[PDB]
Design a protein around this nucleic acid. Structure first.
Ligand SMILES: [Mg+2]
Ligand SMILES: [Mg+2]
Ligand SMILES: [Mg+2]
Ligand SMILES: [Mg+2]
Ligand SMILES: [Mg+2]
Ligand SMILES: [Mg+2]
Ligand SMILES: [Mg+2]
Ligand SMILES: [Mg+2]
Ligand SMILES: [Mg+2]
Ligand SMILES: [Mg+2]
Ligand SMILES: [Mg+2]
Ligand SMILES: [Mg+2]
Ligand SMILES: [Mg+2]
Ligand SMILES: [Mg+2]
Ligand SMILES: [Mg+2]
Ligand SMILES: [Mg+2]
Ligand SMILES: [Mg+2]
Ligand SMILES: [Mg+2]
Ligand SMILES: [Mg+2]
Ligand SMILES: [Mg+2]
Ligand SMILES: [Mg+2]
Ligand SMILES: [Mg+2]
Ligand SMILES: [Mg+2]
Ligand SMILES: [Mg+2]
Ligand SMILES: [Mg+2]
Ligand SMILES: [Mg+2]
Ligand SMILES: [Mg+2]
Ligand SMILES: [Mg+2]
Ligand SMILES: [Mg+2]
Ligand SMILES: [Mg+2]
Ligand SMILES: [Mg+2]
Ligand SMILES: [Mg+2]
Ligand SMILES: [Mg+2]
Ligand SMILES: [Mg+2]
Ligand SMILES: [Mg+2]
Ligand SMILES: [Mg+2]
Ligand SMILES: [Mg+2]
Ligand SMILES: [Mg+2]
Ligand SMILES: [Mg+2]
Ligand SMILES: [Mg+2]
Ligand SMILES: [Mg+2]
Ligand SMILES: [Mg+2]
Ligand SMILES: [Mg+2]
Ligand SMILES: [Mg+2]
Ligand SMILES: [Mg+2]
Ligand SMILES: [Mg+2]
Ligand SMILES: [Mg+2]
Ligand SMILES: [Mg+2]
Ligand SMILES: [Mg+2]
Ligand SMILES: [Mg+2]
Ligand SMILES: [Mg+2]
Ligand SMILES: [Mg+2]
Ligand SMILES: [Mg+2]
Ligand SMILES: [Mg+2]
Ligand SMILES: [Mg+2]
Ligand SMILES: [Mg+2]
Ligand SMILES: [Mg+2]
Ligand SMILES: [Mg+2]
Ligand SMILES: [Mg+2]
Ligand SMILES: [Mg+2]
Ligand SMILES: [Mg+2]
Ligand SMILES: [Mg+2]
Ligand SMILES: [Mg+2]
Ligand SMILES: [Mg+2]
Ligand SMILES: [Mg+2]
Ligand SMILES: [Mg+2]
Ligand SMILES: [Mg+2]
Ligand SMILES: [Mg+2]
Ligand SMILES: [Mg+2]
Ligand SMILES: [Mg+2]
Ligand SMILES: [Mg+2]
Ligand SMILES: [Mg+2]
Ligand SMILES: [Mg+2]
Ligand SMILES: [Mg+2]
Ligand SMILES: [Mg+2]
Ligand SMILES: [Mg+2]
Ligand SMILES: [Mg+2]
Ligand SMILES: [Mg+2]
Ligand SMILES: [Mg+2]
Ligand SMILES: [Mg+2]
Ligand SMILES: [Mg+2]
Ligand SMILES: [Mg+2]
Ligand SMILES: [Mg+2]
Ligand SMILES: [Mg+2]
Ligand SMILES: [Mg+2]
Ligand SMILES: [Mg+2]
Ligand SMILES: [Mg+2]
Ligand SMILES: [Mg+2]
Ligand SMILES: [Mg+2]
Ligand SMILES: [Mg+2]
Ligand SMILES: [Mg+2]
Ligand SMILES: [Mg+2]
Ligand SMILES: [Mg+2]
Ligand SMILES: [Mg+2]
Ligand SMILES: [Mg+2]
Ligand SMILES: [Mg+2]
Ligand SMILES: [Mg+2]
Ligand SMILES: [Mg+2]
Ligand SMILES: [Mg+2]
Ligand SMILES: [Mg+2]
Ligand SMILES: [Mg+2]
Ligand SMILES: [Mg+2]
Ligand SMILES: [Mg+2]
Ligand SMILES: [Mg+2]
Ligand SMILES: [Mg+2]
Ligand SMILES: [Mg+2]
Ligand SMILES: [Mg+2]
Ligand SMILES: [Mg+2]
Ligand SMILES: [Mg+2]
Ligand SMILES: [Mg+2]
Ligand SMILES: [Mg+2]
Ligand SMILES: [Mg+2]
Ligand SMILES: [Mg+2]
Ligand SMILES: [Mg+2]
Ligand SMILES: [Mg+2]
Ligand SMILES: [Mg+2]
Ligand SMILES: [Mg+2]
Ligand SMILES: [Mg+2]
Ligand SMILES: [Mg+2]
Ligand SMILES: [Mg+2]
Ligand SMILES: [Mg+2]
Ligand SMILES: [Mg+2]
Ligand SMILES: [Mg+2]
Ligand SMILES: [Mg+2]
Ligand SMILES: [Mg+2]
Ligand SMILES: [Mg+2]
Ligand SMILES: [Mg+2]
Ligand SMILES: [Mg+2]
Ligand SMILES: [Mg+2]
Ligand SMILES: [Mg+2]
Ligand SMILES: [Mg+2]
Ligand SMILES: [Mg+2]
Ligand SMILES: [Mg+2]
Ligand SMILES: [Mg+2]
Ligand SMILES: [Mg+2]
Ligand SMILES: [Mg+2]
Ligand SMILES: [Mg+2]
Ligand SMILES: [Mg+2]
Ligand SMILES: [Mg+2]
Ligand SMILES: [Mg+2]
Ligand SMILES: [Mg+2]
Ligand SMILES: [Mg+2]
Ligand SMILES: [Mg+2]
Ligand SMILES: [Mg+2]
Ligand SMILES: [Mg+2]
Ligand SMILES: [Mg+2]
Ligand SMILES: [Mg+2]
Ligand SMILES: [Mg+2]
Ligand SMILES: [Mg+2]
Ligand SMILES: [Mg+2]
Ligand SMILES: [Mg+2]
Ligand SMILES: [Mg+2]
Ligand SMILES: [Mg+2]
Ligand SMILES: [Mg+2]
Ligand SMILES: [Mg+2]
Ligand SMILES: [Mg+2]
Ligand SMILES: [Mg+2]
Ligand SMILES: [Mg+2]
Ligand SMILES: [Mg+2]
Ligand SMILES: [Mg+2]
Ligand SMILES: [Mg+2]
Ligand SMILES: [Mg+2]
Ligand SMILES: [Mg+2]
Ligand SMILES: [Mg+2]
Ligand SMILES: [Mg+2]
Ligand SMILES: [Mg+2]
Ligand SMILES: [Mg+2]
Ligand SMILES: [Mg+2]
Ligand SMILES: [Mg+2]
Ligand SMILES: [Mg+2]
Ligand SMILES: [Mg+2]
Ligand SMILES: [Mg+2]
Ligand SMILES: [Mg+2]
Ligand SMILES: [Mg+2]
Ligand SMILES: [Mg+2]
Ligand SMILES: [Mg+2]
Ligand SMILES: [Mg+2]
Ligand SMILES: [Mg+2]
Ligand SMILES: [Mg+2]
Ligand SMILES: [Mg+2]
Ligand SMILES: [Mg+2]
Ligand SMILES: [Mg+2]
Ligand SMILES: [Mg+2]
Ligand SMILES: [Mg+2]
Ligand SMILES: [Mg+2]
Ligand SMILES: [Mg+2]
Ligand SMILES: [Mg+2]
Ligand SMILES: [Mg+2]
Ligand SMILES: [Mg+2]
Ligand SMILES: [Mg+2]
Ligand SMILES: [Mg+2]
Ligand SMILES: [Mg+2]
Ligand SMILES: [Mg+2]
Ligand SMILES: [Mg+2]
Ligand SMILES: [Mg+2]
Ligand SMILES: [Mg+2]
Ligand SMILES: [Mg+2]
Ligand SMILES: [Mg+2]
Ligand SMILES: [Mg+2]
Ligand SMILES: [Mg+2]
Ligand SMILES: [Mg+2]
Ligand SMILES: [Mg+2]
Ligand SMILES: [Mg+2]
Ligand SMILES: [Mg+2]
Ligand SMILES: [Mg+2]
Ligand SMILES: [Mg+2]
Ligand SMILES: [Mg+2]
Ligand SMILES: [Mg+2]
Ligand SMILES: [Mg+2]
Ligand SMILES: [Mg+2]
Ligand SMILES: [Mg+2]
Ligand SMILES: [Mg+2]
Ligand SMILES: [Mg+2]
Ligand SMILES: [Mg+2]
Ligand SMILES: [Mg+2]
Ligand SMILES: [Mg+2]
Ligand SMILES: [Mg+2]
Ligand SMILES: [Mg+2]
Ligand SMILES: [Mg+2]
Ligand SMILES: [Mg+2]
Ligand SMILES: [Mg+2]
Ligand SMILES: [Mg+2]
Ligand SMILES: [Mg+2]
Ligand SMILES: [Mg+2]
Ligand SMILES: [Mg+2]
Ligand SMILES: [Mg+2]
Ligand SMILES: [Mg+2]
Ligand SMILES: [Mg+2]
Ligand SMILES: [Mg+2]
Ligand SMILES: [Mg+2]
Ligand SMILES: [Mg+2]
Ligand SMILES: [Mg+2]
Ligand SMILES: [Mg+2]
Ligand SMILES: [Mg+2]
Ligand SMILES: [Mg+2]
Ligand SMILES: [Mg+2]
Ligand SMILES: [Mg+2]
Ligand SMILES: [Mg+2]
Ligand SMILES: [Mg+2]
Ligand SMILES: [Mg+2]
Ligand SMILES: [Mg+2]
Ligand SMILES: [Mg+2]
Ligand SMILES: [Mg+2]
Ligand SMILES: [Mg+2]
Ligand SMILES: [Mg+2]
Ligand SMILES: [Mg+2]
Ligand SMILES: [Mg+2]
Ligand SMILES: [Mg+2]
Ligand SMILES: [Mg+2]
Ligand SMILES: [Mg+2]
Ligand SMILES: [Mg+2]
Ligand SMILES: [Mg+2]
Ligand SMILES: [Mg+2]
Ligand SMILES: [Mg+2]
Ligand SMILES: [Mg+2]
Ligand SMILES: [Mg+2]
Ligand SMILES: [Mg+2]
Ligand SMILES: [Mg+2]
Ligand SMILES: [Mg+2]
Ligand SMILES: [Mg+2]
Ligand SMILES: [Mg+2]
Ligand SMILES: [Mg+2]
Ligand SMILES: [Mg+2]
Ligand SMILES: [Mg+2]
Ligand SMILES: [Mg+2]
Ligand SMILES: [Mg+2]
Ligand SMILES: [Mg+2]
Ligand SMILES: [Mg+2]
Ligand SMILES: [Mg+2]
Ligand SMILES: [Mg+2]
Ligand SMILES: [Mg+2]
Ligand SMILES: [Mg+2]
Lengths: 124, 97
RNA sequence: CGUAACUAUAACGGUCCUAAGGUAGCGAAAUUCCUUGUCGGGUAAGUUCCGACCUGCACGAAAAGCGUAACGACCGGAGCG
RNA sequence: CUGGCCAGGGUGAAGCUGGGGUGAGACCCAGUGGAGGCCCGAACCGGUGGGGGAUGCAAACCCCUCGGAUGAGCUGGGGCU
RNA sequence: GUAAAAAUGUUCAAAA
RNA sequence: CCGAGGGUAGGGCCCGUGACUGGGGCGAAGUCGUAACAAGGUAGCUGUACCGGAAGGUGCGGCUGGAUC
RNA sequence: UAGCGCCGGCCAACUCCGUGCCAGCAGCCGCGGUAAUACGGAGGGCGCGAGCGUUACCCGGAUUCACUGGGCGUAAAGGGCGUGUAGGCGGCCUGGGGCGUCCCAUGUGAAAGACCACGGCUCAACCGUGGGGGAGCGUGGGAUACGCUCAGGCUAGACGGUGGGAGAGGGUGGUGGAAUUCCCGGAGUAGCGGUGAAAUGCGCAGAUACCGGGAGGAACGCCGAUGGCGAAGGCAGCCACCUGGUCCACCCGUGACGCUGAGGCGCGAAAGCGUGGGGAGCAAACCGGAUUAGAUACCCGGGUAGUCCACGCCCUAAACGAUGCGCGCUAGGUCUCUGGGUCUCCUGGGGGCCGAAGCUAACGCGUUAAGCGCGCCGCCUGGGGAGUACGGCCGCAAGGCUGAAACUCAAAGGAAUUGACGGGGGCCCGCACAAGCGGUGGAGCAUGUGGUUUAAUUCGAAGCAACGCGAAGAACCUUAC
RNA sequence: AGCUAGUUGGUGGGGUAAUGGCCCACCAAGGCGACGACGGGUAGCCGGUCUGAGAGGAUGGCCGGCCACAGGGGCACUGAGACACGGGCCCCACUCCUACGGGAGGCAGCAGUUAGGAAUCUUCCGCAAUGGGCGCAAGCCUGACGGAGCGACGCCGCUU
């Protein structure tokens, strides 16, 4: 690409598509469950993952994943959306901030609690 | 009658004791790969127990091979115990058992 | 006549007959009986009209087939003044 | 066969002339030009819609309206089937 | 420059 | 005179939405056939043209990224 | 007061239980269907600590937009080919200017910030003070090798004069014979044709085969080629005319006039389109015959556009050497076409193979580069979606050019090993076939297996390589039912 | 991918503190554009900040400088200076008052409220300091400013 060609053309500044339009470029978005059910995973695996269709305050309506063991999410559960896909669940590219608004923390969780919203199990 | 799906593209193995199609249902291994199934279906040699059932997930149905030759013998509803097919001349399961 | 992951339907198949069994394109039409077919549009409300879907009673290639700018004291449906 | 008639407007084809362009061209611009079953509209030729007339003015008329109006135009006289 | 004719089905890990 | 703005009319760009329809993607014992990979059983592929349920087939020119004694 | 993240690899840190492709994990590769350092808990361990993790956004790693610092023969990528506009680049020598460019001085570059110091709050964070750098730009002075510019000169680049060379280079006109088909005439008779084998087809209304005569169209056998020519597409009997490019010799002329080239303009195989003409052979479509499960194909018999010519469109291609053009430099060996000459060879242009150094991922390239360098254009930036959609332009149309995104994948892919495979090949064996004799399948009975039946008819083996097999001894024993 | 009528320039006027099509008559056809005009999308710019070996890339929160705005829009008055956030006039939208003839209002000042949102604080203390305004001065005013309050939001020091 001769010096001249660069003088006339120039190089192509790369641009990046936000892998997550939670919008407002915010880290979280207050949503409202509309539907909650189990979706079958992709090709190699096989389970019954728990997911929830949510109506965001950003106008959009996306589906999200609910990590943990069982839940208290229903047709109207308000909830906070986190952001981070799930390479195994088609289009599901947002997580539910387990332990906020109407999403209770994982019951009987000891290991990691920063996630799962479950607090210090005072067993003394 | 037919399938009952929601967001899942495959029927889950209904584990037993619900399957009142045949007698004595008796559980079994996970040996014979999936039609690209991520693994190995659920088998229930069962009445006689010289008889085997592996599960059709796409299909909704479990299919019977003989204990001995290992030759497809039918497809039947887990619900009833009424079959759904003919015996397929063209597959053998005993290479997986 | 039969047949595809529920039903549906039938790319597929069997079979009888023919000189050969209707292609493209169009289709409730200046052709559609059932019929004001069924969706959708327009209206407060629309057997008409416009746009779609074909199970076309009974389109179809020079008794031309499907379009087409311009033209029309032609026949239809709309608004504004 | 031989004569006659078609107010006045409008649009502005081809050509030419000049400029541009090219290797030469094609071609592009203005100006001139004045084409056409072109446009508006009297005479003229019609006869669309309505109203009237219905022992009529009239055995096809009248009023308003509308079509054609340099063309496959209208029309007098002389002829033929 | 010349073999008439013969379609199609199965799916994982082990070594240091 | 100008003039915010209001009103009327016709344009230009974009966005959402629509009976229906086109193709694109993914699916855990769907159907049909075998087009390509080995001369894949008619060498393949290519621009184009006509045609057939489907891959495709055939015509003309092309390429070798084709075997073979 | 001590907490949170982590412990499968990148990544520091290992075991038990629970679970059993479920419940779940997850940043990528992936883990989980019974011993799971990957899931849940625990013990233990690692990391960091009033914090630890998570999500979002930016730089990094990403030399993955590459000035520093990349590429294009097959991985993504050379424009189908010329001509040429602006623009980019410019041979050897002397002189002038002094814009670039270099140096010096000075103005400016505020404060804060950032760097080096020294100090002030007990330290630090913060903070004061001083120092020092700062591309840019403005004014003044100086230098001139290089780039530029004005002027003078040269010939090594480019072009031109002269004399000859080869060639299927292109266009127009004309002409020859071979052969095919059709017609006419003669002679003659029972089949011809065609395939793997046939059939449809043609033939006693006299075909095929042969002879003679005529019409018409298309293509040019042997020469002929690892051959030549052209920018590419592409070009082939012979003849003449009009005409392009190119190679050598002579060193005679001009005197840097040169290279490239966005856009523009012209050309551009076959197929296809329009108007008119021509039409022998061939042949999409189409109709038959066979083959086949089918055969909308392969094979056979027919057969129309089209192929052919003129004029006008179309403008694509594996338009391929998949390699842009130009100039210089870096061993030769061999054969071939064409020249010049002091003809076992020297020398110039071109076409091939093997090959120095060297480049390269390898395969291979190598004075015809993919080597070593400079000038200019073109193009690439993950696979699919897609050369699609929309907009624009062009077209009579078919279509052509320009040319996305959403979404989705964890790859797509190049070259080369090792095998395996082949209705690929070469050479070679075996009761594998052929050659030959006796058999099973048939019937009766014995037995082993399947299936079915049953209170149970126990279990296992399952193409070859399970089936008189385990059982080389089942009346209860055996024996597991 | 073509744009342009106050359009580009001229002459003489009006206007300003002043140049100028800034505006007005008259004249002339001009002005710009692939060195990307015209159009659309987006955005306050800078000293600096973040990151990187650097070049470069990203960025403009606090602090300092400059521009712009003060519910949307237009106008001018006074004035050295403004088209003026807490001045004025008009229109529009919203709020409150009314005796329905009409009135008053502008937190993008400090604090607080409300809505929105993943989320952002006290209706605090003082003019003592510094800076500002008027004033002979004393002094008056100062939600600038000087401090305190709340929040692990950051950096830093400290403890179990
Ligand atoms: Mg470069
Ligand atoms: Mg989601
Ligand atoms: Mg629950
Ligand atoms: Mg529940
Ligand atoms: Mg619950
Ligand atoms: Mg619940
Ligand atoms: Mg993430
Ligand atoms: Mg989703
Ligand atoms: Mg499969
Ligand atoms: Mg059903
Ligand atoms: Mg069905
Ligand atoms: Mg049939
Ligand atoms: Mg049938
Ligand atoms: Mg047909
Ligand atoms: Mg047909
Ligand atoms: Mg049809
Ligand atoms: Mg029609
Ligand atoms: Mg209909
Ligand atoms: Mg209807
Ligand atoms: Mg009809
Ligand atoms: Mg009807
Ligand atoms: Mg009716
Ligand atoms: Mg109705
Ligand atoms: Mg209806
Ligand atoms: Mg309706
Ligand atoms: Mg309606
Ligand atoms: Mg309605
Ligand atoms: Mg009406
Ligand atoms: Mg009506
Ligand atoms: Mg209709
Ligand atoms: Mg119907
Ligand atoms: Mg019919
Ligand atoms: Mg009919
Ligand atoms: Mg008809
Ligand atoms: Mg008819
Ligand atoms: Mg017909
Ligand atoms: Mg007819
Ligand atoms: Mg007609
Ligand atoms: Mg029609
Ligand atoms: Mg048309
Ligand atoms: Mg019409
Ligand atoms: Mg008429
Ligand atoms: Mg009419
Ligand atoms: Mg009306
Ligand atoms: Mg004129
Ligand atoms: Mg003209
Ligand atoms: Mg000229
Ligand atoms: Mg003219
Ligand atoms: Mg005229
Ligand atoms: Mg005139
Ligand atoms: Mg006329
Ligand atoms: Mg008229
Ligand atoms: Mg008229
Ligand atoms: Mg008239
Ligand atoms: Mg009159
Ligand atoms: Mg008169
Ligand atoms: Mg008449
Ligand atoms: Mg009259
Ligand atoms: Mg009348
Ligand atoms: Mg009428
Ligand atoms: Mg009338
Ligand atoms: Mg009347
Ligand atoms: Mg009447
Ligand atoms: Mg009457
Ligand atoms: Mg009139
Ligand atoms: Mg008229
Ligand atoms: Mg006329
Ligand atoms: Mg007459
Ligand atoms: Mg007479
Ligand atoms: Mg054959
Ligand atoms: Mg077959
Ligand atoms: Mg198949
Ligand atoms: Mg099959
Ligand atoms: Mg397979
Ligand atoms: Mg070791
Ligand atoms: Mg006015
Ligand atoms: Mg106005
Ligand atoms: Mg207005
Ligand atoms: Mg108003
Ligand atoms: Mg308005
Ligand atoms: Mg307006
Ligand atoms: Mg409007
Ligand atoms: Mg409008
Ligand atoms: Mg749209
Ligand atoms: Mg729309
Ligand atoms: Mg739309
Ligand atoms: Mg729309
Ligand atoms: Mg839809
Ligand atoms: Mg759709
Ligand atoms: Mg689809
Ligand atoms: Mg496609
Ligand atoms: Mg596809
Ligand atoms: Mg599938
Ligand atoms: Mg399958
Ligand atoms: Mg399939
Ligand atoms: Mg094949
Ligand atoms: Mg093929
Ligand atoms: Mg083949
Ligand atoms: Mg293909
Ligand atoms: Mg082809
Ligand atoms: Mg065609
Ligand atoms: Mg065919
Ligand atoms: Mg071919
Ligand atoms: Mg960690
Ligand atoms: Mg480690
Ligand atoms: Mg234990
Ligand atoms: Mg479980
Ligand atoms: Mg974890
Ligand atoms: Mg266990
Ligand atoms: Mg375990
Ligand atoms: Mg495991
Ligand atoms: Mg572990
Ligand atoms: Mg982990
Ligand atoms: Mg664990
Ligand atoms: Mg522990
Ligand atoms: Mg611990
Ligand atoms: Mg990055
Ligand atoms: Mg690193
Ligand atoms: Mg970089
Ligand atoms: Mg470079
Ligand atoms: Mg690269
Ligand atoms: Mg390729
Ligand atoms: Mg390539
Ligand atoms: Mg090339
Ligand atoms: Mg190419
Ligand atoms: Mg070129
Ligand atoms: Mg070019
Ligand atoms: Mg091209
Ligand atoms: Mg050139
Ligand atoms: Mg130049
Ligand atoms: Mg030049
Ligand atoms: Mg000199
Ligand atoms: Mg000089
Ligand atoms: Mg000098
Ligand atoms: Mg200088
Ligand atoms: Mg300085
Ligand atoms: Mg200085
Ligand atoms: Mg400074
Ligand atoms: Mg300073
Ligand atoms: Mg600072
Ligand atoms: Mg110190
Ligand atoms: Mg210090
Ligand atoms: Mg100190
Ligand atoms: Mg100190
Ligand atoms: Mg210090
Ligand atoms: Mg300092
Ligand atoms: Mg000099
Ligand atoms: Mg000179
Ligand atoms: Mg000389
Ligand atoms: Mg020649
Ligand atoms: Mg000729
Ligand atoms: Mg000739
Ligand atoms: Mg002859
Ligand atoms: Mg013929
Ligand atoms: Mg004869
Ligand atoms: Mg016969
Ligand atoms: Mg006879
Ligand atoms: Mg005879
Ligand atoms: Mg002879
Ligand atoms: Mg002859
Ligand atoms: Mg070449
Ligand atoms: Mg060639
Ligand atoms: Mg010549
Ligand atoms: Mg010559
Ligand atoms: Mg010589
Ligand atoms: Mg010379
Ligand atoms: Mg010499
Ligand atoms: Mg000389
Ligand atoms: Mg001389
Ligand atoms: Mg000279
Ligand atoms: Mg000289
Ligand atoms: Mg041309
Ligand atoms: Mg062509
Ligand atoms: Mg052709
Ligand atoms: Mg033609
Ligand atoms: Mg035609
Ligand atoms: Mg023709
Ligand atoms: Mg013929
Ligand atoms: Mg003919
Ligand atoms: Mg033929
Ligand atoms: Mg065959
Ligand atoms: Mg066959
Ligand atoms: Mg077959
Ligand atoms: Mg075949
Ligand atoms: Mg044939
Ligand atoms: Mg044929
Ligand atoms: Mg055709
Ligand atoms: Mg055609
Ligand atoms: Mg033709
Ligand atoms: Mg192309
Ligand atoms: Mg080039
Ligand atoms: Mg010689
Ligand atoms: Mg040579
Ligand atoms: Mg050579
Ligand atoms: Mg070597
Ligand atoms: Mg080497
Ligand atoms: Mg080589
Ligand atoms: Mg050489
Ligand atoms: Mg060479
Ligand atoms: Mg070579
Ligand atoms: Mg391009
Ligand atoms: Mg892509
Ligand atoms: Mg992509
Ligand atoms: Mg294309
Ligand atoms: Mg388009
Ligand atoms: Mg067009
Ligand atoms: Mg056409
Ligand atoms: Mg198109
Ligand atoms: Mg590739
Ligand atoms: Mg690969
Ligand atoms: Mg390869
Ligand atoms: Mg044998
Ligand atoms: Mg034998
Ligand atoms: Mg034998
Ligand atoms: Mg025998
Ligand atoms: Mg026997
Ligand atoms: Mg048995
Ligand atoms: Mg039993
Ligand atoms: Mg037994
Ligand atoms: Mg048993
Ligand atoms: Mg056992
Ligand atoms: Mg047994
Ligand atoms: Mg056992
Ligand atoms: Mg076995
Ligand atoms: Mg034996
Ligand atoms: Mg004016
Ligand atoms: Mg003036
Ligand atoms: Mg003045
Ligand atoms: Mg002023
Ligand atoms: Mg102005
Ligand atoms: Mg002024
Ligand atoms: Mg004026
Ligand atoms: Mg003008
Ligand atoms: Mg410039
Ligand atoms: Mg630009
Ligand atoms: Mg704007
Ligand atoms: Mg903004
Ligand atoms: Mg920098
Ligand atoms: Mg930097
Ligand atoms: Mg900056
Ligand atoms: Mg900026
Ligand atoms: Mg701020
Ligand atoms: Mg600060
Ligand atoms: Mg502030
Ligand atoms: Mg600031
Ligand atoms: Mg305002
Ligand atoms: Mg406000
Ligand atoms: Mg204002
Ligand atoms: Mg004042
Ligand atoms: Mg004052
Ligand atoms: Mg004043
Ligand atoms: Mg004042
Ligand atoms: Mg003033
Ligand atoms: Mg102001
Ligand atoms: Mg004020
Ligand atoms: Mg104001
Ligand atoms: Mg205020
Ligand atoms: Mg009162
Ligand atoms: Mg007041
Ligand atoms: Mg007010
Ligand atoms: Mg406030
Ligand atoms: Mg507040
Ligand atoms: Mg709030
Ligand atoms: Mg809220
Ligand atoms: Mg504060
Ligand atoms: Mg004070
Ligand atoms: Mg004071
Ligand atoms: Mg004072
Ligand atoms: Mg006082
Ligand atoms: Mg303060
Ligand atoms: Mg604290
Ligand atoms: Mg700390």
């Amino acid at each position: 690409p001769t010096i001249n060609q660069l003088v006339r053309k120039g190089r192509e500044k790369v641009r990046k598509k936000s892998k997550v339009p939670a919008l407002k470029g915010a880290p979280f978005r207050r949503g409202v469950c509309t539907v909650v059910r189990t979706v079958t995973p992709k090709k190699p695996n096989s389970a019954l993952r728990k997911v929830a269709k949510v109506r965001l305050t950003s106008g959009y309506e996306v589906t999200a994943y609910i990590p943990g063991e069982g839940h208290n999410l229903q047709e109207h559960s308000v909830v906070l959306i986190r952001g981070g896909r799930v390479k195994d669940l088609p289009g599901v590219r947002y997580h539910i901030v387990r332990g906020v608004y109407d999403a209770a923390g994982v019951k009987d969780r000891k290991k990691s609690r920063s996630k799962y919203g479950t607090k210090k199990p005072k067993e003394a | 009658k037919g399938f009952k799906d929601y967001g899942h593209d495959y029927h889950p193995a209904p584990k037993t004791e619900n399957i009142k199609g045949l007698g004595d249902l008796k559980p079994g291994i996970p040996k014979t790969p999936k039609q690209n199934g991520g693994g190995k279906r659920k088998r229930w040699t069962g009445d006689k127990g010289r008889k085997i059932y592996e599960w059709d997930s796409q299909a909704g149905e479990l299919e019977g091979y003989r204990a001995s030759d290992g030759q497809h013998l039918g497809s039947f509803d887990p619900k009833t115990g009424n079959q759904l097919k003919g015996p397929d001349p063209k597959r053998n399961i005993k290479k997986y058992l």
